[PDB]
Amino acid sequence: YELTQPPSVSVAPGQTARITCGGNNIGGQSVHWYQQKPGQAPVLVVYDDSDRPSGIPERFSGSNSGNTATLTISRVEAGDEADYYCQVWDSSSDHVVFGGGTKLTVLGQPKAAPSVTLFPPSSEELQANKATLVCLISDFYPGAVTVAWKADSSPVKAGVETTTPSKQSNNKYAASSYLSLTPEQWKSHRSYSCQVTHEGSTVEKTVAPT
Amino acid sequence: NLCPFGEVFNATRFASVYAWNRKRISNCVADYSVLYNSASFSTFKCYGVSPTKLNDLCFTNVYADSFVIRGDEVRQIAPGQTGNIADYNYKLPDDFTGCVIAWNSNNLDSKVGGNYNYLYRLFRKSNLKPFERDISTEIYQAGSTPCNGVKGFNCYFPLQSYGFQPTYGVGYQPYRVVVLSFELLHAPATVCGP
Amino acid sequence: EVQLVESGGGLVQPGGSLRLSCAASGFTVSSNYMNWVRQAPGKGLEWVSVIYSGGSTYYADSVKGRFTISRHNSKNTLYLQMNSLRAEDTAVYYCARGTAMAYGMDVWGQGTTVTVSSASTKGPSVFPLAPSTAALGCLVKDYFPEPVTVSWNSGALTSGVHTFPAVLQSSGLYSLSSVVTVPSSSLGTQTYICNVNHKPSNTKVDKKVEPK
Ligand SMILES: *[C@@H]1O[C@H](CO)[C@@H](O)[C@H](O)[C@H]1NC(C)=O
Numbered sequence: 001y002e003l004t005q006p007p008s009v010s011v012a013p014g015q016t017a018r019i020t021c022g023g024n025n026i027g028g029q030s031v032h033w034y035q036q037k038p039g040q041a042p043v044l045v046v047y048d049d050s051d052r053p054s055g056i057p058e059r060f061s062g063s064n065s066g067n068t069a070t071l072t073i074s075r076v077e078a079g080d081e082a083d084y085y086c087q088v089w090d091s092s093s094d095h096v097v098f099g100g101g102t103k104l105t106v107l108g109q110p111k112a113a114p115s116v117t118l119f120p121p122s123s124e125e126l127q128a129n130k131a132t133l134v135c136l137i138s139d140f141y142p143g144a145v146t147v148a149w150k151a152d153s154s155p156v157k158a159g160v161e162t163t164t165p166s167k168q169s170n171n172k173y174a175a176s177s178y179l180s181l182t183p184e185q186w187k188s189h190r191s192y193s194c195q196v197t198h199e200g201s202t203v204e205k206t207v208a209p210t
Numbered sequence: 211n212l213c214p215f216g217e218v219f220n221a222t223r224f225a226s227v228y229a230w231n232r233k234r235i236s237n238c239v240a241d242y243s244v245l246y247n248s249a250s251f252s253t254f255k256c257y258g259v260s261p262t263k264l265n266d267l268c269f270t271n272v273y274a275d276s277f278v279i280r281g282d283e284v285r286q287i288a289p290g291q292t293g294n295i296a297d298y299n300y301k302l303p304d305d306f307t308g309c310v311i312a313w314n315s316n317n318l319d320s321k322v323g324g325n326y327n328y329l330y331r332l333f334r335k336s337n338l339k340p341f342e343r344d345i346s347t348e349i350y351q352a353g354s355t356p357c358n359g360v361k362g363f364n365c366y367f368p369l370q371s372y373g374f375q376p377t378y379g380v381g382y383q384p385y386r387v388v389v390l391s392f393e394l395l396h397a398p399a400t401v402c403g404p
Numbered sequence: 405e406v407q408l409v410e411s412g413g414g415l416v417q418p419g420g421s422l423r424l425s426c427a428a429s430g431f432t433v434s435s436n437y438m439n440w441v442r443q444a445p446g447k448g449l450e451w452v453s454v455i456y457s458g459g460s461t462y463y464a465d466s467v468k469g470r471f472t473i474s475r476h477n478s479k480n481t482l483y484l485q486m487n488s489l490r491a492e493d494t495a496v497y498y499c500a501r502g503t504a505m506a507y508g509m510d511v512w513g514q515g516t517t518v519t520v521s522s523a524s525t526k527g528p529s530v531f532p533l534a535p536s537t538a539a540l541g542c543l544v545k546d547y548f549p550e551p552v553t554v555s556w557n558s559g560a561l562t563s564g565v566h567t568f569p570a571v572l573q574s575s576g577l578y579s580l581s582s583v584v585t586v587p588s589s590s591l592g593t594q595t596y597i598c599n600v601n602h603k604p605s606n607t608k609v610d611k612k613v614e615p616k
Contacts, residue, residue: 027375028280028382032508034449041498041515042449047508066377085449089504091282092381094293094462096439096451096504117583119533119541123616134533134543134581136568164446166569176568176581210616292460294505332506335435337458353431364431370506 001025001090003099008144008199012107017076019102021069021086029088031069033062037082045084046071078106105142112172114140114198118205121186131186133179133207135194140165143173146197152190213240213401218274219249219311224319224386227299228331228369229345230277237400240272241265251313252385253284258307259392267392268399275300275341275389278319278328280372282381284312287389298331300389303340308391316376319384324373328384332370341391406430406511408499413516420489420520426482426499426513434477437503440484442495443515445572452497453484466492489520491574521576523548527607528579530600532614537587540613542598544570545579553601554582561596591615 004022011017021031033046044053046062049069059074073080086099114137121131137145143165149156159180165173177194186192186209193206213235225231242264246254259267279287279295286296289306296302302310319325333350346368349357353364361367374384412424424440440452453463453473461473472485482499496517502509526548533541544552554567561584570580582598592615599610 025379025382028378030504030506032504041512043512044508044510048506053510087504087508091280095464096454098449098451101448117539119543119581122531122533122543125531132543132545134541136581136583138566161571161573163569163571174566174568176571178571178579297456297458297460332503333457335457337460352436366507
């Protein structure tokens with residue numbers, strides 16, 4: 001079972017934020033929404049798809065429609081910046097399934113498209129029987145990107161290692177991804193591409209063996 | 211003098227799993243192959259016996275237990291299983307000799323706004339013994355503080371509702387389940403096959 | 405007074421064993437649904453295990469056969485025994501009360517950290533990221549532990565430098581990159597020397613980056 005959440009949701013202070021959660025059997029399941037502030041433990045903010053726990057502000061509301069559960073945060077304040085997770089119990093696999101997590105960031109800055117630089121393995125690296133592709137993303141806001149590595153046109157997940165976005169000196173965000181492979185796979189492919197998806201816009205950079 | 215299996219399988223209304231309905235069958239002949247070859251049952255699993263041999267076998271009593279669960283919980287109605295239905299609602303013995311029959315009842319037990327008349331036990335301190343029944347609705351005490359019969363912190367209502375809807379997935383659709391236990395004591399076997 | 409307090413986390417070699425404890429106050433563990441839920445650094449929440457009030461247990465596919473959930477009513481404590489540990493188990497582990505079937509998980513612990521790594525003090529490898537205005541790079545690979553210092557031309561080049569935060573590898577090592585934005589007119593004119601200093605291993609390396 002999979003619970004699908006948008007990785008990032010950005011809303012200006014005082015506006016209304018909506019976080020969706022999709023699943024094949026969500027209509028029959030009880031969806032629970034948890035909030036996790038940076039550095040802390042998760043807190044329950046919605047249970048049984050619409051019920052507010054004691055101590056949770058009234059602006060946190062749960063809604064269910066068909067097979068989609070929506071957490072609505074009204075009159076959003078900057079303190080609500082956090083990672084929000086939807087959770088169910090899937091009885092098809094006897095599992096507690098979590099969503100991918102949505103990074104709710106309260107906008108206090110103009111949106112900035114990411115700048116991506118891709119570096120192929122060095123000659124000395126291939127001489128040392130190793131190879132590393134270095135994708136570097138910088139100068140993007142909000143600080144949430146999705147990194148996808150492709151060999152020619154086929155997605156690759158083995159050897160992918162990405163950092164959590166980090167604030168720069170200019171209040172913008174940066175991250176780094178590394179693809180590790182043997183020189184065999186490096187020289188037996190057309191090109192290797194790093195795709196960085198930020199706020200629904202994808203920026204792709206490709207390199208080829210020379 | 212046919213065994214009254216019709217009023218168990220073709221019953222208009224079915225019991226909740228937490229309050230499952232037992233019907234004793236004795237002093238009649240029963241054709242089990244007609245059961246295995248009719249109504250297009252979703253699941254029909256026999257432990258310790260086969261229907262073809264059942265048609266040529268004799269037993270002291272036959273207990274038919276009827277209830278309604280969701281499809282994904284049908285696999286819980288089996289010996290050696292765990293889970294909410296198996297532990298807190300309906301438990302089969304490890305030596306279970308008998309059959310389990312289940313069929314989809316979405317067209318009967320589902321409603322557009324949600325059918326909440328079917329309930330299952332979610333909270334219980336200890337697992338049920340085999341064939342034990344618990345229809346109590348006393349407020350479950352999770353903490354050390356007494357509950358005094360009111361819902362609150364550490365004070366949960368033991369039963370939960372399925373809320374069956376036609377648009378639900380198959381694993382979350384209402385399935386009707388009949389469990390046939392075959393009891394063979396040191397008494398003349400009055401219920402047999404042709 | 406309603407709290408969950410975790411303990412037992414720390415550093416464990418791959419293939420080792422470790423027991424996590426979660427002491428409860430404000431409710432009785434033996435009569436509650438109790439879950440262990442872990443979170444890897446930078447990734448999302450992953451449910452690990454649950455124990456029912458009646459004793460039935462469920463585990464995630466990733467930990468099946470290795471982890472064991474248990475409880476002690478005398479100390480009102482939940483326990484998670486973890487054997488045959490691998491690097492992918494490195495995470496912060498929380499204990500929580502409740503069932504996802506209804507009412508959710510309300511009370512959570514503060515979480516304890518578990519790091520499965522065999523990494524020791526190791527010097528880095530410094531490699532050149534050549535350009536095709538133009539971008540030059542120094543790749544620092546497979547070093548432990550933090551931190552490492554990167555400069556360009558003995559620290560005399562600072563305009564346009566960017567030393568990215570290091571990655572935390574599954575093996576337990578670290579790696580980062582440092583980028584300088586230089587003009588295309590100075591590719592074959594000026595020499596660019598990147599100096600990397602790692603004090604734990606006394607490793608100082610200077611590398612020249614030139615176009616291919
Ligand atoms: C239920 O009704 C159908 C109607 O055709 C019949 O064939 C079937 O035998 C009945 N069920 C039982 C258990 O007799």
